[PDB]
Design brief:
Blueprint: E1 11-14, H1 24-39, E2 43-48, H2 61-70, E3 78-80, H3 85-97, E4 101-104, H4 108-117, H5 128-140, H6 143-146, E5 149-152, E6 167-171, E7 186-188, H7 190-201, E8 205-209, H8 215-225, E9 232-236, H9 248-256, H10 271-276, H11 281-291, H12 302-313, E10 319-320, E11 322-324, E12 329-333, E13 341-346, E14 356-361, E15 364-367, H13 369-373, E16 380-383, E17 387-394, E18 399-403, E19 415-416, E20 419-420, E21 427-434, E22 454-461, E23 473-476, E24 480-488, E25 492-498
Parallel strand pairs: 1-2, 2-3, 8-9, 10-23, 12-18, 16-19, 21-25
Antiparallel strand pairs: 4-5, 5-6, 6-7, 11-22, 12-15, 13-14, 15-20, 16-17, 17-18, 21-22, 23-24, 24-25
Helix pairs in contact: 7-8, 11-12
Bound molecules: chloride ion (CL) (5 copies) and manganese (II) ion (4 copies).
Residues 261-262, 265 line the site of one chloride ion.
């Protein structure tokens, strides 16, 4: 819903916590806020939701910004929740002075169960000036102040657990804030800060994953009680996948235990990781647009996302060939000579926009051991993109065959790929095939870790693959889809298999 949205006057905002790397969960949010803003020719704010102190190992803002650019999402302005602390304090005092907030020194268990059973706590009827004295205590971070929090005074008998005096401010004196250090001793809560900040920042349409509770009634109460400009708020379903560890504790465990090497490892749910695994932002965004709502708590399968991605990339990438380097066996076309013939072929047989490549042939070829051990004497097979041959004797250590290129491809059922036996021009490559880090769909947990989830293979590839640049995607004939990840000394390629949904 873009309720009462007006063309040219919509402002949304994407509000990630600046305390971690962007991961695919953020995906939906980042896109939908951009989607709706473009639908209405409006603006999308980027607000780092730094409302409470969190110990950070790195300033994550740069990472988030870079990933957002890598998704084509552009935003009008960048703010911090923390930029409104002074304003938020002002409003908190106004709340106290309208008798719509009180200080409460009741304990956490007691408070939780009085909210459960609906008992208004003793302090609910404090005087305004007592509430003010206590709030200043919190602002100062004294003993008393740390004993206290500020709650909204709504309705403890309400049907909705979120309207029974939610907490608005808290006193945190020991954890530093990633921007203001220990300058603030009290901090607003998410529930109090979000409506206020959206309102004063110009947001017309706040978008939020459904948290299964009716925070909406609360949001709205805050906005009306304070007499602020109204913000519409639409809840959409969270996007989460199976076999995906999204918990920072367990992610850090992986990283510090050398199960992965960085937070950008392709088995990780970070945006950098999944792009590195070969996903297109087009695929992800179309997946989001096409998936509809999801019951709170449901996890999606990866297969549809990768199938979308395959349909996207299949028509716009070159097709090259590669064989297993240590097990490839030699096939000799005994009627030809070792003169090296070079023919122009098309990089895509059905998309000449990608252009041409050079193909080399000789009397000597490299074919797959599986393909090889499938052959039979006097069997006429097809070297793809080249022509047909008839096998003579399967010596498997060698295969001898005779050329017959001018015959038709129709009468042939076996159509194998190949590499010209030119070791000084064949390109050596490492293929990485990744698997999920956990064996289960959701959560003694480390006993479900797939430790051997990075399979490496050495292959030879056509010389023309040298033309590829880092991050290029392509297809290996009868092998699958890959993305160039790294170029090494002596043009050794590191290639990551892109899942295809099958
Ligand atoms: Cl609470
Ligand atoms: Cl939804
Ligand atoms: Cl955690
Ligand atoms: Cl790595
Ligand atoms: Cl086949
Ligand atoms: Mn920071
Ligand atoms: Mn010769
Ligand atoms: Mn010929
Ligand atoms: Mn495996």
């Amino acid at each position: 819903a873009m309720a009462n949205a007006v063309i040219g006057n919509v402002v949304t905002r994407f509000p990630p916590e600046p305390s971690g790397y962007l991961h695919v969960g953020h995906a939906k949010a980042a896109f939908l806020n951009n989607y709706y803003a473009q639908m209405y020719e409006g603006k999308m704010l980027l607000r780092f939701d730094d409302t409470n102190p969190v110990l950070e190992d790195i300033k994550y803002e740069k990472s988030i910004i870079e990933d957002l650019e890598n998704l084509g999402l552009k935003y009008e302005k960048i703010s911090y929740s923390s930029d409104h602390f002074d304003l938020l304090e002002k409003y908190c005092i106004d709340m106290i002075k309208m008798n719509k907030a009180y200080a409460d020194d009741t304990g956490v268990e007691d408070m939780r169960n009085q909210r459960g059973e609906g008992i208004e706590s003793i302090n609910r009827n404090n005087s305004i000036e007592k509430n003010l004295e206590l709030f200043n205590e919190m602002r100062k971070g004294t003993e008393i102040g740390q004993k206290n929090c500020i709650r909204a005074k709504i309705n403890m008998q309400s049907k909705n657990k979120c309207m029974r005096d939610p907490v608005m401010y808290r006193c945190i004196v020991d954890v530093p804030h990633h921007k203001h250090q220990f300058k603030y001793k009290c901090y607003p809560t998410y529930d109090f800060a979000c409506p206020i900040i959206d309102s004063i920042e110009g947001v017309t349409h706040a978008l939020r994953t459904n948290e299964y509770s009716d925070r909406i009634e609360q949001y709205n109460w805050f906005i009306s009680t304070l007499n602020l400009r109204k913000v519409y708020i639409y809840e959409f379903s969270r996007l989460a996948f199976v076999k995906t560890v999204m918990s920072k504790r367990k992610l850090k465990w992986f990283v510090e235990n050398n199960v992965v090497d960085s937070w950008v490892d392709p088995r990780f749910p970070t945006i950098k990781g999944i792009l590195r695994r070969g996903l297109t932002k087009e695929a992800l965004f179309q997946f989001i647009l096409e998936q509809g709502p999801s019951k709170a708590g449901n996890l999606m399968q990866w297969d549809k996302l990768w199938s979308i991605n395959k349909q996207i990339i299949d028509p716009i990438i070159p097709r090259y060939a590669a064989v297993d380097k240590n097990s490839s066996i030699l096939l000799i076309l005994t009627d030809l000579t070792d003169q090296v013939i070079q023919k122009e072929r098309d990089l895509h047989m059905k998309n000449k926009s990608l252009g041409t490549c050079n193909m080399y042939y000789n009397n000597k070829y490299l074919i797959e051991l599986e393909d090889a051990q499938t052959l039979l004497e006097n069997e006429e097979i097809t070297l793809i993109k080249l022509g047909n041959i008839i096998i003579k004797n399967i010596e498997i250590k060698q295969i001898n065959a005779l050329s017959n290129f001018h015959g038709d491809f129709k009468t042939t059922k076996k159509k194998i790929h190949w590499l010209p036996y030119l070791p000084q021009q064949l390109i050596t490559c490492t293929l990485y095939e990744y698997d999920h880090l956990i064996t289960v769909d959701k959560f003694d947990w480390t006993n479900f870790i797939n430790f051997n989830s990075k399979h490496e293979t050495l292959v030879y590839a056509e010389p023309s693959i040298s033309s590829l640049k880092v991050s290029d995607k392509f297809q290996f004939e009868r092998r699958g889809y890959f993305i160039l990840d790294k170029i090494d000394p002596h043009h050794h390629l590191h290639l990551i298999k892109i899942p295809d949904g099958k």
